[PDB]
Design a protein around this motif. Structure first.
Motif: not given
Length: 116
Positions: A60, A67, A71, A90-91, A93-95, A98-99
């Motif tokens: 993103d 981040q 990723w 998925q986790s 992307k959601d937040d 927390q990367s």
């Protein structure tokens, strides 16, 4: 051309089957090519892996460098299955904040499931 896969060619087939980022025209193409000419396994696998790594989902634009680095590392860890990989992604992307913890959790699992 060989009529049966040896151990090497079998392993090439299985990885190509599971490479997550190949489009289905690509996956079918590599599998049929390997079946048509098993001797090309090394070149076909290398070709497929290149396309797979290049087609890993894009980060993103709102991600900062930390981040984005998390990723792309998670997306290329070699010793995760895709259920595991997609779970971490998925986790993220959601937040995205927390990367760091997600990366650490992913790398630990990757190292634990590593081959000899």
């Amino acid at each position: 051309a060989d009529n049966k896969f040896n151990k090497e060619q079998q392993n090439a087939w299985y990885e190509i089957l599971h490479l997550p980022n190949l489009n289905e025209e690509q996956r079918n193409g590599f599998i049929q090519s390997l079946k048509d000419d098993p001797s090309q396994s090394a070149n076909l696998l290398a070709e497929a892996k290149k396309l797979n790594d290049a087609q890993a989902p894009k980060a993103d634009n709102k991600f900062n460098k930390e981040q984005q680095n998390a990723w792309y590392e998670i997306l290329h860890l070699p010793n995760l299955n895709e259920e595991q990989r997609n779970g971490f992604i998925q986790s993220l992307k959601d937040d995205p904040s927390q990367s760091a913890n997600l990366l650490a959790e992913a790398k630990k699992l990757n190292d634990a499931q590593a081959p000899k």
